[PDB]
Amino acid sequence: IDRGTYRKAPLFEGELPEGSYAQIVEIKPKQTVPKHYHEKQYELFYIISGQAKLGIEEREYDAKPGDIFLVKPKTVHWVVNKKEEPFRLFVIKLNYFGDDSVWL
Amino acid sequence: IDRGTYRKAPLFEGELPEGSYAQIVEIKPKQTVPKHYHEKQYELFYIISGQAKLGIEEREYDAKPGDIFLVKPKTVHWVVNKKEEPFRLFVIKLNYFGDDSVWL
Ligand SMILES: [Mg+2]
Ligand SMILES: [Mg+2]
């Protein structure tokens, strides 16, 4: 499914307990996902493939395959894919009740 | 941390919302994790490395790196590591309130 700066594929759609969601995300080639935070949800990310700058709060990380991150609620985050390869991650949302994104 | 047939490393210990837990598991070389089910918890597994037979209910899967599985509550499951390499997975527990394993 296309979302402009990224594509997403839901995993086990409807089979996870209320409050949880899982998906594959691919940040497109050379794309920035700009600064945003979630009001309620937590996000766990497992990096499958590619490389990107991943920003959480004041820190920017060199995200590489095998890395795992946690983005807590009301924590700004962003991604800069500087490569021609998609930046692919396995995403688990927790305390998730629908879109709660604030874009800056 | 050693658990006999597997080793585990908690991830973001204490930072996840109540009801959720994350860890790295490594099923040891050549080891079987025998049939068991959870009363309440759901388990999402991302296979990092190695190969194993993963049983869920009546189905046995050839689990390989990149595969993702969901084990629902009160669903029997088991793993047979036939390789000398550890079977390494990223595990997210949902609807998780403590050890609720029934071993058969
Ligand atoms: Mg986010
Ligand atoms: Mg289990």
Residue numbers in the entry:
A (entry chain A), B (entry chain A): 9 to 112
Can you provide the manuscript's text about this entry?
To investigate protein HHP adaptation, Elastic Incoherent Neutron Scattering (EINS) and Quasi-Elastic Neutron Scattering (QENS) have been employed to study the dynamics of two orthologous proteins from T. barophilus (Tba) and T. kodakarensis (Tko), which only differ by their optimal growth pressure. X-ray crystallography was performed to obtain the structures of the proteins. Both present very similar features: their structure is dominated by β-sheet contributions with turns and disordered regions connecting them, forming a jelly-roll barrel structure, and both present a dimeric quaternary structure. The active site is located in a pocket inside the barrel and is conserved between the two proteins (His44, His46, Glu51 and His85). The two orthologs differ at 16 positions, and most of the substitutions are located at the protein–water interface and involve mainly polar and charged residues, with the notable exceptions of I35V, located in the hydrophobic core of the protein, and I100V, located at the monomer–monomer interface.
Interestingly, the catalytic metal ion coordinated by these four residues is found to be magnesium in Tba PMI and zinc in Tko PMI; however, the structure’s resolution does not allow for making a definitive assignment, as the Van der Waals radius of both ions is smaller than the resolution. Tba PMI crystals belong to the I222 space group and contain one molecule in the asymmetric unit, while Tko PMI crystals belong to the P31 space group and contain eight molecules in the asymmetric unit. After model building using Coot and Refine from the Phenix package (Tba PMI) or REFMAC5 (Tko PMI), the final structures exhibited an R(%)/R(%)free of 0.18/0.20 at 1.7 Å (Tba PMI) and 0.23/0.29 at 2.2 Å (Tko PMI). The results show that the mechanisms by which Tba PMI counteracts the effect of HHP are: (i) the prevention of excessive amounts of water from penetrating the solvent-accessible cavities and limiting their destabilization, (ii) the inhibition of protein–water cooperative relaxations, and (iii) the reduction of internal (i.e., inaccessible to the solvent) cavity volume. In the dimer-forming region, the I100V substitution optimizes the contact between the two monomers and decreases internal cavity volume, stabilizing Tba PMI’s quaternary structure under extreme conditions and seemingly maintaining optimal functionality.
